Design an enzyme around this catalytic site. Structure first.
Site, mmCIF file in Angstrom:
data_model
loop_
_atom_site.group_PDB
_atom_site.id
_atom_site.type_symbol
_atom_site.label_atom_id
_atom_site.label_comp_id
_atom_site.label_asym_id
_atom_site.label_seq_id
_atom_site.Cartn_x
_atom_site.Cartn_y
_atom_site.Cartn_z
ATOM 1 N N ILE A 60 9.197 5.298 6.346
ATOM 2 C CA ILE A 60 10.528 5.723 6.916
ATOM 3 C C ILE A 60 11.139 4.426 7.233
ATOM 4 C CG2 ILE A 60 11.874 6.832 8.444
ATOM 5 C CD1 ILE A 60 9.566 9.237 8.406
ATOM 6 N N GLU A 72 -6.058 2.107 10.204
ATOM 7 C CA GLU A 72 -7.039 2.217 9.063
ATOM 8 C C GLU A 72 -6.397 2.287 7.752
ATOM 9 O OE1 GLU A 72 -7.576 7.223 10.249
ATOM 10 O OE2 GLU A 72 -9.301 6.020 10.340
ATOM 11 N N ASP A 129 8.676 15.419 9.673
ATOM 12 C CA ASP A 129 8.823 15.056 8.542
ATOM 13 C C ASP A 129 7.458 15.243 7.571
ATOM 14 O OD1 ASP A 129 10.135 13.904 5.794
ATOM 15 O OD2 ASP A 129 9.555 12.117 6.258
ATOM 16 N N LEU A 165 -6.210 4.432 3.996
ATOM 17 C CA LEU A 165 -6.416 5.769 3.686
ATOM 18 C C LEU A 165 -6.257 5.824 2.071
ATOM 19 C CD1 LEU A 165 -4.063 7.896 6.040
ATOM 20 C CD2 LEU A 165 -6.380 7.374 6.275
ATOM 21 N N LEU A 178 0.776 -1.101 -0.216
ATOM 22 C CA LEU A 178 0.013 0.074 -0.007
ATOM 23 C C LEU A 178 0.962 1.301 -0.044
ATOM 24 C CD1 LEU A 178 -2.890 -0.821 2.654
ATOM 25 C CD2 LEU A 178 -3.041 -0.541 0.003
ATOM 26 N N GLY A 179 1.922 1.141 0.563
ATOM 27 C CA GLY A 179 2.917 2.355 0.654
ATOM 28 C C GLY A 179 4.359 2.051 1.220
ATOM 29 N N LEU A 180 5.142 3.021 1.115
ATOM 30 C CA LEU A 180 6.610 2.828 1.790
ATOM 31 C C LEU A 180 6.709 3.845 3.025
ATOM 32 C CD1 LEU A 180 8.248 1.916 -1.460
ATOM 33 C CD2 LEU A 180 7.610 0.426 0.350
ATOM 34 N N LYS A 193 1.697 -1.792 9.214
ATOM 35 C CA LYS A 193 3.234 -1.298 9.083
ATOM 36 C C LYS A 193 4.142 -2.378 9.891
ATOM 37 C CE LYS A 193 5.504 3.096 8.524
ATOM 38 N NZ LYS A 193 5.513 4.252 9.209
ATOM 39 N N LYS A 253 7.538 -1.119 5.526
ATOM 40 C CA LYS A 253 6.630 -0.916 4.356
ATOM 41 C C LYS A 253 5.170 -1.219 4.789
ATOM 42 C CE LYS A 253 7.771 -5.895 3.107
ATOM 43 N NZ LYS A 253 7.321 -6.833 2.200
HETATM 44 C C1 LIG Z 1 -7.023 1.059 -1.162
HETATM 45 C C2 LIG Z 1 -6.185 1.512 -0.335
HETATM 46 C C3 LIG Z 1 -5.026 2.304 -1.045
HETATM 47 C C4 LIG Z 1 -4.032 3.008 -0.217
HETATM 48 C C5 LIG Z 1 -4.132 2.839 1.248
HETATM 49 C C6 LIG Z 1 -2.995 3.170 2.239
HETATM 50 C C7 LIG Z 1 -1.748 3.539 1.786
HETATM 51 C C8 LIG Z 1 -0.878 4.047 2.517
HETATM 52 C C9 LIG Z 1 -1.096 4.151 3.879
HETATM 53 C C10 LIG Z 1 -2.384 3.661 4.298
HETATM 54 C C11 LIG Z 1 -2.908 3.974 5.649
HETATM 55 C C12 LIG Z 1 -1.923 4.035 6.443
HETATM 56 C C13 LIG Z 1 -0.546 4.337 6.018
HETATM 57 S S1 LIG Z 1 0.614 4.718 7.452
HETATM 58 C C14 LIG Z 1 1.859 5.048 6.249
HETATM 59 C C15 LIG Z 1 1.412 4.676 4.838
HETATM 60 C C16 LIG Z 1 0.080 4.393 5.089
HETATM 61 N N1 LIG Z 1 1.995 4.981 3.734
HETATM 62 C C17 LIG Z 1 3.304 5.180 3.359
HETATM 63 C C18 LIG Z 1 4.247 6.169 4.217
HETATM 64 C C19 LIG Z 1 3.245 7.566 4.085
HETATM 65 N N2 LIG Z 1 3.940 5.908 5.819
HETATM 66 C C20 LIG Z 1 3.078 5.443 6.590
HETATM 67 O O1 LIG Z 1 3.423 5.369 7.976
HETATM 68 N N3 LIG Z 1 -3.360 3.230 3.407
HETATM 69 C C21 LIG Z 1 -5.108 2.118 1.695
HETATM 70 N N4 LIG Z 1 -6.194 1.526 1.254
#
Ligand SMILES: Cc1ccc(-c2ccc3c(ccc4sc5c(c43)NC[C@@H](C)NC5=O)n2)cn1
Ligand SMILES: O=C(c1ccc(-c2ccc(Br)cc2)o1)N(Cc1ccccn1)c1ccc(N2CCNCC2)cc1
Ligand SMILES: O=C(c1ccc(-c2ccc(Br)cc2)o1)N(Cc1ccccn1)c1ccc(N2CCNCC2)cc1
Ligand SMILES: O=C(c1ccc(-c2ccc(Br)cc2)o1)N(Cc1ccccn1)c1ccc(N2CCNCC2)cc1
Ligand SMILES: O=C(c1ccc(-c2ccc(Br)cc2)o1)N(Cc1ccccn1)c1ccc(N2CCNCC2)cc1
Ligand SMILES: O=C(c1ccc(-c2ccc(Br)cc2)o1)N(Cc1ccccn1)c1ccc(N2CCNCC2)cc1
Ligand SMILES: O=C(c1ccc(-c2ccc(Br)cc2)o1)N(Cc1ccccn1)c1ccc(N2CCNCC2)cc1
Ligand SMILES: Cc1ccc(-c2ccc3c(ccc4sc5c(c43)NC[C@@H](C)NC5=O)n2)cn1
Ligand SMILES: Cc1ccc(-c2ccc3c(ccc4sc5c(c43)NC[C@@H](C)NC5=O)n2)cn1
Ligand SMILES: Cc1ccc(-c2ccc3c(ccc4sc5c(c43)NC[C@@H](C)NC5=O)n2)cn1
Ligand SMILES: Cc1ccc(-c2ccc3c(ccc4sc5c(c43)NC[C@@H](C)NC5=O)n2)cn1
Ligand SMILES: Cc1ccc(-c2ccc3c(ccc4sc5c(c43)NC[C@@H](C)NC5=O)n2)cn1
Ligand SMILES: [Cl-]
Ligand SMILES: [Cl-]
Ligand SMILES: [Cl-]
Ligand SMILES: [Cl-]
Ligand SMILES: [Cl-]
Ligand SMILES: [Cl-]
Lengths: 277, 280, 276, 276, 279, 276
Positions: free
Chosen positions: D30, D95, D142, D97, D26-28, D49, D33
């Site tokens: 610090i 949750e 950050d 996002l 879903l994301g990367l 995470k 992942k």
């Molecule tokens: C459909 C769909 C598409 C995307 C996402 C989504 C993407 C990234 C995050 C997230 C929820 C919490 C956190 S926390 C976190 C995140 C994320 N991303 C990377 C970096 C910014 N660092 C963090 O701590 N949900 C959920 N559902």
């Protein structure tokens, strides 16, 4: 019962402006000789202790001054800071104590020694000086008959404690319930002065000390281990008619463990000491 | 603002009872000691006596108070004695009497009424004169509060004087004309806490209540601590409605949470609102 | 067969999920105020001590928990770790002690003071709390009437030790090993013994052995009388008082902590066991 | 104002007992992942995470938890301490996002950029997350478009601050005590204010106030322009932009951190206040 | 303000007398050494020579000055020699000649007449250009005064140049777009003392006397010291009567006793009163 | 040489203006302060005032000058005041006036003519009396030069007095104890002996034994000539000068301080004693 006393004002003028300094040696102290001096204006006789200025000399003057405020410690009249040979020196002007040492009054008695009433009166007057020092957190650490001088040869003369060459200062709760160790945890032991009272008391009664070198030496390994072990006795010839009340008082002051030893408050409230009144 | 040669502190060693009659009537309570009422034995004049047990903190209070005493806006020291009591040295500070009551008292007497911009400017100028002297001789009072500013008399010509140096602290290869202040004397921002106190007192004079307080009457609460750290205060419209942009901005500059952003005493004393009650 | 107590399980849920927290201040502790709270389910009244989380607060909770396992120490019902204003805090839920402090029972007596049998019963119940703490290597360090509360106003009420704000943990051939060889101690338990001597004095006469002559909170004279051991048993009030209890007080008011009486010696003293 | 929040209860059971852990990234972050996971019982989608247990990971979880209690910071559902390959690891269930990063909404606008009204609303919602952190003595350190994600694609979606990989705790007479006397700051919240100034600039024109002339990530020229405070408001893009927002940016981009605007001053600025 | 690739310092080891004729005519006195009059043997051209005994402080002055030399507002270093003299190593800095006299002389020559706001803003702008370069390359001069600012020639188009790095000090030991300055380079020393010096020189240009001085003509006095720390200065009405509140506010911002409250060189160089010199 | 009981230093705390009228006429410039002309308010007598700001170096100058003051060849201290100025403590040294001019002025007034061995021995003997006193009380002046030696009056009975303790430093079986066993020396008195050798050389010819060839204040050549001991007695001026005084100068200008002559040996040298 304490009162507001004046602080020490060290005079800087040359002592010879106010006093005539003679070379008659009145006595020898721990850190300096005591000379006989005379007030230039009043012609009155005084004793002068001369110390070279240094931290130990500053301590002796400071502690003696605080103690001086008691009738049982030799009075300081003035303190001077003068220069001699480019070195600072402290000159303590004190009252004269012409009644001789307690060491002399002991030697003059010899084998006759003192009665339990005579000894209790001497011990009570020594104890009054010690009670004052301990109450203001000062341990004399050199209590002996050579340092206790009589004011005059009269029978109403006061015995006074002198020489603070070894003296040392010994020093978040509910006041009513705070324990002594919580208030002031002791830096030094006053209890060494209690041991000295036990030694002087033993001598007053028989004419010899509880600990000595068998071959008349100043100090011997045997004398040292007898002190450390608490090896002394009350020999029957002299100690025969002596009460077990004073024998027990001596046992409590000559306890080798300082925390087991009697305090000055307990000593001053002992019936044998209070008998004097 | 000119300096002159002042005498050093000569601590008297004679017993204070030789010169004064010491009563047990407690005139006030200081940071490090109680202030009692005493009388000169010769003149029968009434004086105030602060009693401190000798120690490095007591020596600091006497030394800093003495240097400050040389100013008409700081309580005058008449004499300092070093005496013995219970075998312990003690410093006895004889000061003039300040019978006009505290600025805190004059504040509770006004209640909800508070003071006008002309009355507050009057009061703030006199506190500022005491602070300007201390800061000019590198002393930070560190406890500037109405309970420490006393009036000389009950008269309308009475002087407001700064007292209690229990928390006071001393705050201290170039071309003279051009040398920057930080090059001469580097300081750790102790003075700027006195500027914050002026901002708090100024706010109280104008409305009757402080800029920061505990909502539930507590002495100190985590919410109140965060409000000071964040700089969360307001000028409630009922009381601050008539108050000028000029004094609201002066308070904003003294209540800056960043000490280096805060106004200096020189800038405060040259502010038009403070100089409005200055007799040129 | 195997006697074991449970460890402390600090609850993490918000205390408001289980209790209704009122702002009625029940008392003031060393490190925090005690509030009146109510169990949401049972409607039962409880006391809540609020501490900001920190090493001193963790120590108070930890030492009070180990002590809580004794009937003479205020019982801990639950301990919560919650957040408030972004700061962690420990919330100690304890039983209610509505019988008033021993300080009040002392003040209410006034000049009348207590009998040797009444005082020995009070001292024996204080000594039971101290014997438990000392046996588990804990010195209370703030033993005073204000920290001893009664469970109820009834005549069968238990006197309980509270407030572990100053409490501190005090820590070969087995048959012959000396105590100092096993656990060398700081010498913190002996101040609790001095406290018993002061409370015992106050019980038998109505006034303390050491006080400022001019009603001050603390005075240089009061300090030197404590250090010297300058106190007396004035004849008006201490006239008919036995020399057995005078000697017990003398042994607890020894200025040298190593000369002072231990809790074991105090609990085996005939005057204390007189109660039974 | 603040309320009593629950503490962090780290679950010790295997996360696979409660969730199905997919490999869709879903994301990367610090320090780890973020993967897509599903609640086994509810089938609901969550973000996970994964951090290897260590003091830096314990700090991120602890500070994120205290901040999580604010609607403008990504919510933590659960935290697990599990073993993998004989090493402890912290697994943060959060949750989802799904509304995309603020970075994406910025890129999608391109040269069109945002109106002073649109930018004010975005800045106010970023400032709400920062005001909460600073009020509980936490500096995020950050703040950037990439770490601010939208809850959903809807127009009523909330912008949330994420990733406490660099976050740091800034700390250890009441009426008159100065702030520096209460809490002397261990770290600078000031750098988060500088980041708001940079984001605000990017929202109004489409490019940053400081950049490398030759498209580099960082250059010695870009470094000295930041240290000197060398930036401008180019006329094509900043011609019709109000001097109110140009002055707001000047106050957040002050090179001296003590000269910079606080979060309280930013949140009470008319240009930010206008949104509500 | 862009930077370019400059050559490094090549310290020559041949005897300076192979290339220059060294005279004993003292052109000036520096913090760490006297400045002598020398001549290029080949071109017969006039140069200034600073002589420093080799040591860490001398190596720092040469190193710092060299970096700054790559700017039109700082006195140019032509060459640096490491030679032996009296059996000791020494650094000989060959610089351009600044025959137009010090700004100190131009100030004394004006006297009570002082300079106009237009004349003072031109002088201040040229001093500020030297400071902006130093601060941009993390160098604080730390002795900015009229005596250290010399004119290139006696002409009216002469350039004012900053000289003497005897007290100069280097002031230095995340996502790029958003990194705050304090995160990149936290300060080793403060450049803000140079800003205070600009405020003092600006006050002198507009009126003829300094903002802080000893009342009894002393070089330095305790009163002068407390006036500086306090920030006790005024704008006396005889001279400062017709002076604009724009330049009085500029001076107030440079003479802030708190260095963090003081104006930066970027803010000073973008101030309308300074930029007026080029409409 | 016999010592006597001298009074200690009593620093007066009253404002100096209560006792003296302080003029701005500068009488001279010292190492750590300027010397002003003052007048006793009661007697109208003229005095010299040295003003130093209180600090360890100022306390040392006053303390060492006081101990030395007890000698007729060192400038007398009348009083020392500790006053406040600009909120800073300062030491105000009231000294006797030395209106007879410096030895330096006398040397310049002679010029090329110089002084004969008989009058040069008289000057040297009076300088040596001040040095013998300092060395006997373990003080090294460390700045012995004609500028610091002033005459009491313009009269022919005027005494030459040593002034300025700005660089002064304290240097610290009975029959058989060696000097190094009693007091091992902290600093060096022998630099004062070198200064006597330099002053003696100047008196006899009009120029110093070491100088910069190009009139500089100090030069690397001058420094290496001192370190090497490179000086000569040029024939024009030193032609008829005795080999007795040439040898005395050689012994005081020994580059090795331990090879140098002591003050006792200097004061017992026939050429110095000739003056009587
Ligand atoms: C459909 C769909 C598409 C995307 C996402 C989504 C993407 C990234 C995050 C997230 C929820 C919490 C956190 S926390 C976190 C995140 C994320 N991303 C990377 C970096 C910014 N660092 C963090 O701590 N949900 C959920 N559902
Ligand atoms: O030192 C002493 C000593 C005796 C009396 C005192 C004494 C010391 C201080 C004071 Br203040 C006042 C008296 O000291 N010794 C040891 C010793 C051993 C051998 C030779 C010399 N000395 C001592 C001497 C004799 C006796 N006895 C003889 C008379 N019958 C009873 C016992 C006891 C002890
Ligand atoms: O402590 C104070 C307080 C009021 C005035 C002062 C005060 C303090 C020192 C001085 Br010197 C002089 C005045 O302090 N509180 C907090 C508090 C709350 C509840 C119970 C007790 N205390 C306070 C009370 C009311 C207000 N108001 C809100 C705005 N409208 C007017 C009234 C403000 C502050
Ligand atoms: O403080 C106390 C005090 C008396 C009783 C208690 C007391 C303290 C804790 C508890 Br729990 C319960 C009682 O404290 N003082 C000193 C004091 C003096 C002046 C003004 C205020 N306080 C005290 C007063 C009188 C006496 N006397 C009683 C009759 N015999 C002679 C002595 C003893 C002590
Ligand atoms: O890095 C950027 C950049 C442009 C837009 C953004 C950008 C950064 C973060 C976010 Br979230 C969203 C946008 O960054 N550069 C430097 C650069 C130089 C050369 C090649 C690549 N990059 C940049 C490019 C063009 C401009 N110009 C726009 C029109 N007027 C003249 C200047 C400004 C900066
Ligand atoms: O030092 C200076 C000074 C004046 C001008 C300059 C000066 C210094 C550096 C440069 Br680059 C260029 C000028 O210095 N003083 C002090 C001083 C006082 C007493 C005796 C000697 N010196 C001075 C200051 C102000 C005045 N005035 C008061 C206000 N109205 C006009 C006259 C006079 C002298
Ligand atoms: O400095 C001195 C100097 C001479 C006399 C004094 C002198 C120093 C201290 C006192 Br107190 C009183 C006099 O100093 N120089 C060097 C110098 C050179 C050029 C310009 C300035 N200085 C000096 C000058 C001439 C000679 N001579 C060589 C031998 N034949 C006679 C002339 C020696 C030394
Ligand atoms: C006629 C006459 C005979 C004797 C004396 C006399 C002798 C010794 C002392 C003294 C007063 C004080 C002190 S103090 C002190 C002293 C003395 N002696 C040495 C030891 C005990 N140590 C000391 O410190 N008076 C005076 N007048
Ligand atoms: C008739 C009458 C009424 C009041 C007073 C009076 C009361 C308090 C003080 C004072 C003088 C100096 C100081 S100093 C000081 C003080 C006081 N009070 C407590 C706190 C503020 N701290 C201090 O240091 N005069 C005298 N006479
Ligand atoms: C109706 C009613 C009346 C009184 C009480 C009551 C009062 C105080 C406490 C208490 C229970 C525990 C603790 S603990 C503790 C306390 C108290 N008080 C302050 C000090 C002693 N310190 C502490 O730690 N219960 C309860 N209910
Ligand atoms: C006709 C004529 C008149 C003057 C000059 C002249 C004077 C001084 C300097 C100079 C060139 C460089 C430097 S550098 C430097 C200098 C000087 N002077 C002392 C101080 C400011 N410090 C230094 O380092 N040119 C040249 N030719
Ligand atoms: C009429 C008239 C003419 C001259 C003098 C006069 C001159 C200089 C000094 C002096 C007294 C003491 C000191 S001390 C000292 C001094 C001086 N001068 C500078 C150097 C050598 N260093 C010092 O410390 N009296 C007095 N009255
Ligand atoms: Cl033996
Ligand atoms: Cl609150
Ligand atoms: Cl009392
Ligand atoms: Cl670039
Ligand atoms: Cl001045
Ligand atoms: Cl030479």
């Amino acid at each position: 019962q304490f009162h507001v006393k004046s602080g020490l004002q060290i005079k800087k003028n040359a002592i010879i402006d106010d006093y005539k300094v003679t070379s008659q040696v009145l006595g020898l102290g721990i850190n300096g000789k005591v000379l006989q001096i005379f007030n230039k204006r009043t012609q009155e006789k005084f004793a002068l202790k001369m110390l070279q200025d240094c931290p130990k000399a500053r301590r002796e003057v400071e502690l003696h001054w605080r103690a001086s405020q008691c009738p049982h410690i030799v009075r300081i009249v003035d303190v001077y800071e003068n220069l001699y040979a480019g070195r600072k020196c402290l000159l303590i002007v004190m009252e004269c104590l012409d009644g001789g040492e307690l060491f002399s009054r002991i030697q003059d008695r010899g084998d006759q020694a003192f009665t339990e009433r005579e000894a209790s009166e001497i011990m009570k007057s020594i104890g009054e000086a010690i009670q004052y020092l301990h109450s203001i957190n000062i341990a004399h650490r050199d209590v002996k008959p050579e340092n206790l001088l009589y004011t005059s040869k009269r029978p109403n003369a006061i015995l006074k404690l002198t020489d603070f060459g070894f003296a040392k200062e010994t020093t978040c709760y509910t006041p009513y319930y705070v324990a002594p160790e919580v208030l002031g945890p002791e830096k030094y032991d006053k209890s060494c002065d209690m041991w000295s009272l036990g030694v002087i008391m033993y001598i007053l009664l028989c004419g010899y000390p509880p600990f000595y070198s068998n071959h008349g030496l100043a100090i011997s390994p045997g004398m040292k281990t007898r002190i450390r072990m608490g090896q002394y006795e009350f020999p029957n010839p002299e100690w025969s008619e002596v009460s077990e009340e004073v024998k027990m008082l001596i046992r409590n002051l000559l306890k080798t463990e300082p925390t087991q030893r009697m305090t000055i408050t307990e000593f001053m409230n002992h019936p044998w000491i209070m008998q004097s009144t």
